[PDB]
């Protein structure tokens, strides 16, 4: 366990005497279940996929490319494919669902396809199945779609949002696939938790429960399939089990709003990142509020993400934007 620094061009930007803003922003970060790739995305910078073979971080710098999704729009989130190792489903802001390939032998990145279903206003959410047999592209404005991947990317069915809930024009902040791949957990704006059945190609809602009274920010899942953890704009971060669909723990540490939730691959530590530049860690099987660490982050917005294979700690949060990787953190002081 020692502090080791992450070697991208973001550390060279701040090391020079450059005044105004050295990198710009971070939009999304997703892992493939292999646990060796990365989708490090920026706003006007570069979406940089990474492939480090054996060393900690100081082996090689793989690829940075600004002109990957074009030169006019940005990409909301980058979904990796569980079936194909060389496939990343990037969805641009306005009208592009393109599908890219990466090459290890060459310093380039090629594109396999760019399929689109028309009258696409803004698709901001794309995520594959945990087994990699479906793709639910969901707009926050009009309706939610459903495709496949095993034969090709062909549409099957779609559901309009106004049939799910009936209050007002609601925004879909975050939604999450089930762990078997058979259900959809979707998080509304007024604190509704709706459960949609997506077996193979049919999309129908089961029930809706009132989680709390705010925008449900994130929804994560337990690798042992006992429970699922939600976030909030309030201080609440409940833990709902699945066999009875009631609440078990309550993480009542209401000092700010909640922005980022992660779990561990063993399912022990819950990592909550708030808006006062304070991060936490907790326990799932143990009692309610039993911290292991709290860390004061600096003035800018951080992000938090856990590896799928072994417990290694990715935070961001340097002076403008840089990521930190904490090695061998089984104890963490």
């Amino acid at each position: 366990e020692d502090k080791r620094f992450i070697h991208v061009s973001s550390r060279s930007h701040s090391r020079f005497t450059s005044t105004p803003i050295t990198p710009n922003e971070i939009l999304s970060l997703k892992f493939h279940v292999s646990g060796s790739s990365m989708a490090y995305s920026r706003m006007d910078g570069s979406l940089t996929v990474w492939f480090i073979k054996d060393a900690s971080f100081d082996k090689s710098v793989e690829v940075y490319i600004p002109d990957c999704c074009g030169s006019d729009k940005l990409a909301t989130d980058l979904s990796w494919n569980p079936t194909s190792l060389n496939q990343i489903a990037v969805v641009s802001n306005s009208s592009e669902i393109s599908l890219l390939l990466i090459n290890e032998k060459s310093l380039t990145a090629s594109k396999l396809r760019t399929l689109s279903l028309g009258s696409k206003t803004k698709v901001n959410t794309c995520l594959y199945d945990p087994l990699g047999n479906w793709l639910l592209a969901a707009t926050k404005s009009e309706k939610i779609y459903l495709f496949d991947v095993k034969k090709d990317h062909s549409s099957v069915c779609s559901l309009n949002i106004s049939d799910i809930s009936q209050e007002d024009n609601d925004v879909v902040y975050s939604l999450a696939w089930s762990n078997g791949g058979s259900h959809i957990f979707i998080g509304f704006k007024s604190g509704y938790l709706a459960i949609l059945k997506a077996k193979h190609g049919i999309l129908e809602v089961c029930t809706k429960i009132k989680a709390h009274t705010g925008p449900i920010t994130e929804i994560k899942m337990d690798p042992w399939g006992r429970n699922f953890i939600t976030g909030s704009i309030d201080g609440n971060c409940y833990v709902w089990n699945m066999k009875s669909l009631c609440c078990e723990l309550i993480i009542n540490d209401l000092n700010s709003a909640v922005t980022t939730l992660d779990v561990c691959h063993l399912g022990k530590i819950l990592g909550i990142c708030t808006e006062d530049e304070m991060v936490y860690f907790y326990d799932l099987n143990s009692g309610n509020l039993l911290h292991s660490k709290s860390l004061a982050n600096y003035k800018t917005d951080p992000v938090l993400k856990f590896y799928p294979d072994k417990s290694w700690y990715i935070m961001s949060g340097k002076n403008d934007t840089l990521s930190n990787h904490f090695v061998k953190n089984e104890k963490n002081l």
Binding site: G180, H183, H212, T213, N236, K243, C247
Partner: protein, 610 residues
């Protein structure tokens, strides 16, 4: 120990709670009461061997295995064997959760039947050869009753035949029979088992929805009206910080009349102190926690203190609201800080808040002051709180407050006038025309965007809060109150011409009630715009005949409605000029009705032009 030794450890622990419940010590572990700096001017170890070793360990190891019949026989003899260990209530909950889990999964069937298909685990894959391998667990046996799961292993209870004495039951007619036995032991103690309080209420909402039909809803609702009063709502008050498990109890309470919800809400504040002990300690733990937020309530720390405040009123609002309203009718500049918190309430909190506001408006106090020249200082401070809820938060049903306005105006009441007056100026943006410039006065009669400019200069916001003003009249038109308010403000103003109180007072009281009736008419014409207008307001062929409000008032409601029909069509033009009836105040025998009626028919929109 012995039995006469345990009964004197019970009285030694019951007195210690009541000594802390009444006044007690409060926070000696502060950095001001501990440190004092000025520059220039025995029986414990015996009472540790009562919990860990003895009868109490025997009485709670018989509940872990299966043996319930001796423990129920003991805890009916000596009920104050609780308040001793907190673990003896968790094991009457694990027994009761087994008897109800086959029942709970049958009513909420198709969700939980797919939730054994939802409860699946991730498979650990490999990077090199693209494998797909499941996870490897181990099954160990321990002496602790609750199931655990370590990094690589599970811990199951060793005594696998622990449940063979017990039997789960049928739909409802045994759950109403096995609860007088088990849930009368742990009476107000289900707050330590918050998952069991949701599963009984999720049955009660899914029992009314299943028995929806048309027939069995009068007895099926009165069945759960005695099951929530008896041991579900007193179990909610012994909850510390739990917003989600409190809304599940209210989801079964939405199916009740609002009259028998205010009977449960009022029972909790007279059975608070005169009755059962462990919620009397918990009602005094929230009143000293509500008052510790209203002292540290500032305009800079309100980002972190409003979420801390609303979380407390989401859990126990029978205790954290009667303090919090007492500092509303005394001090302002916290009324602007309370209504910023109210965006984070839940729907349980919005019902007691309407009950607490009705609790203070009817309390025995002098509403008028010693002389009569001023009303009071609370009646004008409470009316900016009520009118501040109706503007900011849209999820608060205020229909019982408006029903309080309607009935008390028949008696003649100064609080109902003062709540209604601040509702119009705050929610709507109606301003009075008695300070107005003469150049702006001619600009307010020309129907134009200049009319929209003349209200921008006089600060009369109507195009901004047009949504919030329509929601307020929606509560008036649901009870059909719009034709009742206009007749009540006119009658009370005319009834105030005979009261003898002072000489300068009733020259201002008559003027203030006159510009309230003008201010409510102007809210009607902005909201009920179109075909909805004629259904609520009374037609003036009977407003002048049945009632007798005088001729400037009758024409004032109706001039803008006859205007848009006369410029619609020529066939529409002939219709409204014949629309009339008897006139009590004027005789059309010597005044020429051609020129008389077009006086009141015309406005200043078409006399002057620039």
């Amino acid at each position: 120990p012995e039995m006469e030794f345990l009964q004197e450890y019970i009285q030694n622990l019951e007195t210690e709670l009541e000594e802390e419940s009444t006044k007690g010590v409060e926070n000696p572990l502060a950095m001001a009461a501990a440190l004092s700096t000025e520059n220039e001017t025995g029986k414990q170890k015996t009472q540790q061997d009562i919990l860990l070793f003895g009868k109490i360990k025997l009485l709670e190891r018989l509940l872990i295995h299966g043996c319930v019949i001796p423990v129920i026989h003991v805890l009916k003899q000596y009920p104050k064997v609780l308040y001793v260990s907190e673990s003896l209530s968790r094991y009457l909950g694990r027994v009761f959760e087994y008897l109800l889990n086959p029942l709970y999964t049958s009513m909420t069937s198709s969700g939980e039947s797919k939730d054994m298909a939802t409860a699946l685990m991730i498979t650990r894959i490999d990077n090199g050869i693209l494998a797909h391998k499941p996870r490897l667990i181990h099954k160990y046996k321990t002496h602790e009753p609750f199931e655990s799961l370590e990094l690589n292993s599970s811990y199951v209870f060793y005594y696998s035949e622990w449940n063979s004495n017990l039997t789960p039951f049928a739909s409802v007619n045994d759950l109403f029979e096995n609860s007088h036995i088990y849930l009368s032991i742990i009476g107000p103690y289900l707050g330590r088992i918050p998952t069991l309080l949701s599963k009984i209420s999720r049955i009660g909402v899914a029992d009314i929805q299943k028995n929806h039909g048309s027939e069995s809803l009068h007895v099926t609702i009165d069945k759960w009206i005695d099951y929530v009063r008896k041991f579900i709502f007193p179990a909610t008050s012994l909850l510390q910080n739990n917003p989600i498990a409190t809304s599940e109890v209210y989801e079964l309470m939405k199916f009740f009349p609002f009259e028998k919800r205010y009977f449960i809400y009022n029972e909790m504040m007279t059975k608070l102190s005169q009755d059962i002990l462990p919620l009397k300690v918990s009602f005094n733990k929230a009143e000293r926690e509500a008052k510790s937020i209203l002292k540290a309530l500032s305009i800079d720390t309100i980002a972190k203190e409003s979420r801390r405040f609303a979380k407390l009123i989401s859990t126990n609002p029978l205790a954290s609201l009667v303090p919090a309203v007492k500092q509303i009718e005394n001090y302002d500049k916290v009324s602007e800080l309370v209504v910023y918190t109210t965006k984070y309430f839940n729907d349980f909190a919005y019902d007691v808040l309407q009950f607490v506001l009705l609790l203070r408006l009817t309390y025995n106090r002098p509403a008028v002051q010693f002389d009569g020249v001023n009303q009071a200082m609370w009646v004008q401070r409470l009316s900016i709180f009520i009118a501040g809820l109706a503007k900011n938060c849209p999820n608060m049903d205020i229909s019982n407050i408006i029903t309080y306005i309607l009935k008390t105006l028949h008696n003649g009441n100064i609080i109902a006038v003062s709540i209604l007056k601040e509702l119009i100026i705050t929610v709507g943006g109606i301003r009075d025309l008695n300070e107005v410039n003469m150049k702006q006065l001619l600009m307010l009669n020309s129907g134009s965007p200049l009319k929209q400019y003349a209200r921008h200069l006089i600060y009369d916001f109507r195009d901004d809060n047009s949504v919030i003003s329509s929601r307020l009249t929606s509560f008036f038109t649901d009870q059909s109150a719009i034709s009742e308010i206009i007749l009540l403000l006119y009658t009370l103003n005319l009834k105030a011409n005979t009261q003898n109180s002072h000489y300068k007072i009733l020259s201002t009281r008559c003027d203030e009630m006159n510009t309230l009736l003008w201010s409510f008419i102007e809210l009607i014409k902005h909201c009920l715009k179109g075909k909805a207008f004629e259904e609520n307001v009374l037609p003036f062929v009977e407003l002048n005949n049945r009632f007798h409000l005088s001729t400037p008032w009758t024409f004032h409601i109706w001039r803008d409605y006859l205007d848009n029909q006369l410029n619609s069509n020529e066939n529409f033009s002939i219709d409204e000029l014949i629309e009339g009836a008897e006139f009590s105040d004027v005789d059309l025998t010597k005044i020429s009705k051609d020129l008389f009626t077009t006086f009141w028919r015309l406005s200043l929109y078409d006399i002057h032009f620039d």
